Design a protein around this ligand. Structure first.
Ligand SMILES: *[C@@H]1O[C@H](CO[C@H]2O[C@@H](C)[C@@H](O)[C@@H](O)[C@@H]2O)[C@@H](O[C@@H]2O[C@H](CO)[C@@H](O)[C@H](O)[C@H]2NC(C)=O)[C@H](O)[C@H]1NC(C)=O
Ligand SMILES: *[C@@H]1O[C@H](CO[C@H]2O[C@@H](C)[C@@H](O)[C@@H](O)[C@@H]2O)[C@@H](O[C@@H]2O[C@H](CO)[C@@H](O)[C@H](O)[C@H]2NC(C)=O)[C@H](O)[C@H]1NC(C)=O
Ligand SMILES: Nc1c2c(nc3ccccc13)CCCC2
Ligand SMILES: *[C@@H]1O[C@H](CO)[C@@H](O)[C@H](O)[C@H]1NC(C)=O
Ligand SMILES: *[C@@H]1O[C@H](CO)[C@@H](O)[C@H](O)[C@H]1NC(C)=O
Ligand SMILES: *[C@@H]1O[C@H](CO)[C@@H](O)[C@H](O)[C@H]1NC(C)=O
Ligand SMILES: *[C@@H]1O[C@H](CO)[C@@H](O)[C@H](O)[C@H]1NC(C)=O
Ligand SMILES: C[C@@H]1O[C@@H](O)[C@@H](O)[C@H](O)[C@@H]1O
Ligand SMILES: O=CN1CCC[C@H]1C(=O)O
Ligand SMILES: [Cl-]
Ligand SMILES: [Cl-]
Length: 524
């Protein structure tokens, strides 16, 4: 199977899926490899080739540091890159139903990883099931991460910032220009992503350059208003200069700094990324999105508040235990290998780990709000997880959804509370950050892979709801006497719970906690 694109022919491969066939094109280039003089610059447009490009295997993942905290452990290692690392990493993947569809809706995945890690080739992002079951087309792309993708010297096109976001945008443009050739509808494209990928999705809603490039958006566990998601101009400058110093590239002509950094091997840059800040936390994002005056024209909180974004439908949600994953990467008393019953004192030391630059009054106020118990030994353990999850993910997602819906668009919010039966992390960590993803991509539909019957059922319905949102803008499951998903409005704030047992309509998720984080805490 061979498809003619604008820049040349590509050959794909046939896959067998559920007694049917899916056609996969893995590793199509969408930009000039950003090497040599091109490192740190916006992605440059592609050449044009005369032969047939073999797209029959995942391409290189972008350069990045790897998680080495738990060698041999599937829980952490499943997120590590499964393909060679290289600066030559600007490639995308396409899954298509067989027989070739005529005008199929397109789903474009953007992975998360704190803007420092990630790759589109992970097992949990395999689009072949969505293509097989719902007959949509699935696209995913690799984008630059870390300093290589987000190094900023505002105004300087040698390193203007936001390069990884421009990588994403160029791929959306590739779909606009080429997807009809694959049987897709360029007028029916839904972006979806998780964590930093969801933050990216929300930023595409704000970038005027992305507005004509997609129809609707889905945000899983992330939004730009999260405290880790956008780096200030002040922080970005101090970090760029710190990087230059650590690598011996401190100069006076800022452009000369960039030249010096271009002569360093990727490993020396990667090695020094962790130290551009005096203290980090498990949620540190040293090189992330900035206000560059190009992709992002002003502080995004201002744009959101004043209604300056694409007017369309959104689907947003979070998991029950967003915060727990991070506790075992530094908080004292914690371990994936015991029940982590911590003391008041340990909770206090824990806040210092996650809020290192915050005043003593600020840390006390967190403790006051989360430690009025009604006693129970796991009180402090659970409080710290909730602190981390509410501050970093849930409260920002809820505030994003309210502000967005106030300008008249339909929004739908979910609360995912099912813990995978195959979860390799201990049960005290609950419904973890990142563990709805395999349900969305329909992994439990494969009966050969250890999931329960109830989980097959949950994933099937989730897959249908996501597909109906992309196609029709309304995430219902209309056939099997399902609970109707009500629109989220700023007054009533209805949301839908996703679980194996009882799907329910609820109101005002974490009302009391979020009043603390959203209204008060930004003042300390
Ligand atoms: C902006 O940058 C300076 C640079 O600090 C150094 O820190 C190293 C970890 C590394 O990045 C190196 O390249 C860089 O020169 C920060 O100054 C530091 O601030 C801390 C806390 O105030 C002091 O304890 C240190 O003495 C000082 N570092 C040294 C050794 O000079 C500064 O904090 C930072 N500003 C911020 C955080 O916005
Ligand atoms: C749960 O485990 C943590 C982590 O302890 C680590 O180190 C060894 C004790 C090893 O056997 C293994 O259990 C684990 O990887 C214990 O918390 C504390 O961890 C800090 C880390 O800085 C150490 O300073 C403490 O010494 C350690 N406590 C102890 C008992 O020494 C924690 O106590 C344990 N909690 C339980 C048993 O519920
Ligand atoms: N590295 C991780 C990522 C995610 N969840 C994780 C959970 C536990 C440990 C590492 C993780 C979800 C977003 C992508 C990366
Ligand atoms: C592409 O793959 C096919 C596999 O049959 C092969 O015939 C062709 O030569 C390949 N082109 C390359 C590797 O350049
Ligand atoms: C698909 O739908 C669009 C409207 O979005 C229509 O204009 C277009 O012609 C269709 N393409 C095909 C080939 O069906
Ligand atoms: C810095 O050096 C570059 C490259 O030689 C040059 O183009 C530019 O004019 C210089 N800028 C300043 C501020 O001196
Ligand atoms: C609807 O229910 C049937 C069984 O009655 C099941 O086979 C099918 O997968 C369900 N459809 C969805 C979208 O959940
Ligand atoms: C906006 C687009 O319009 C037409 C349809 O074929 C697509 O599915 C989408 O609704
Ligand atoms: O994985 C690492 N991090 C750090 C900040 C956000 C988070 C993520 O899952 O995208
Ligand atoms: Cl709960
Ligand atoms: Cl139901």
């Amino acid at each position: 199977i061979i498809i003619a694109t604008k820049n040349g022919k590509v050959r794909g491969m046939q896959l067998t899926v559920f007694g049917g066939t899916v056609t996969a094109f893995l590793g199509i280039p969408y930009a000039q490899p950003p090497l040599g003089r091109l490192r740190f610059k916006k992605p440059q447009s592609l050449t044009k080739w005369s032969d047939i490009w073999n797209a029959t295997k995942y391409a290189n993942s972008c350069c990045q540091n790897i998680d080495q905290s738990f060698p041999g452990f599937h829980g952490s290692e499943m997120w590590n890159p499964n393909t060679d690392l290289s600066e030559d990493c600007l490639y995308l993947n396409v899954w298509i139903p067989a027989p070739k569809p005529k005008n199929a809706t397109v789903l474009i995945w953007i992975y998360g990883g704190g803007f420092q890690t990630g790759t589109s080739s992970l097992h949990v992002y395999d689009g072949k099931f969505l293509a097989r079951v719902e007959r949509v087309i699935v696209v995913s792309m690799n984008y630059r991460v870390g300093a290589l993708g987000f190094l900023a010297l505002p105004g300087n096109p040698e390193a203007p910032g936001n390069m990884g976001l421009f990588d994403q945008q160029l791929a959306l443009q590739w779909v606009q220009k080429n997807i009809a050739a694959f049987g897709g509808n360029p007028k029916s494209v839904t972006l979806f992503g998780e964590s930093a990928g969801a933050a990216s999705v929300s930023l595409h809603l704000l970038s005027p350059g992305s507005h004509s490039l997609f129809t609707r958006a889905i945000l899983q566990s992330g939004s730009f208003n999260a405290p880790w998601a956008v780096t200030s101009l002040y922080e970005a400058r101090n970090r760029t200069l710190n990087l230059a110093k650590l690598t011996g590239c401190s100069r006076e002509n800022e452009t000369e700094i960039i030249k010096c950094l271009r002569n360093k091997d990727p490993q020396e840059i990667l090695l020094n990324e962790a130290f551009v800040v005096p203290y980090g936390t498990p949620l540190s994002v040293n090189f992330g999105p900035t206000v560059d005056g190009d992709f992002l024209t002003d502080m995004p909180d201002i744009l959101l508040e004043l209604g300056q974004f694409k007017k369309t439908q959104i689907l947003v949600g979070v998991n029950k235990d967003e915060g727990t994953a991070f506790l075992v990467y530094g908080a004292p008393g914690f371990s994936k290998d015991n029940n982590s019953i911590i003391t008041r004192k340990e909770f206090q030391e824990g806040l210092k780990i996650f809020f290192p630059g915050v005043s003593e009054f600020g840390k006390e106020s967190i403790l006051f709000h989360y430690t009025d118990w009604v006693q129970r030994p796991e009180n402090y353990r659970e409080a710290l997880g909730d602190v981390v999850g509410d501050y970093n993910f849930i409260c920002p997602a809820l505030e994003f959804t309210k502000k967005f819906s106030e300008w008249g668009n339909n929004a739908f919010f979910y609360y995912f509370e099912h813990r995978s039966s195959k979860l390799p992390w201990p049960e005290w960590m609950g419904v973890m950050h990142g563990y709805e993803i395999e349900f969305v991509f329909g992994l439990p539909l494969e009966r050969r892979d250890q999931y329960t019957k109830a989980e097959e059922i949950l994933s099937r319905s989730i897959v249908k709801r996501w597909a109906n949102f992309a196609k029709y803008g309304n995430p219902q499951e209309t056939q099997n006497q399902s609970t109707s998903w009500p629109v989220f409005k700023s007054t009533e704030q209805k949301y839908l719970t996703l679980n194996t047992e009882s799907t329910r309509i609820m109101t005002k998720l974490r009302a009391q906690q979020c009043r603390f984080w959203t209204s008060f805490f930004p003042k300390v």
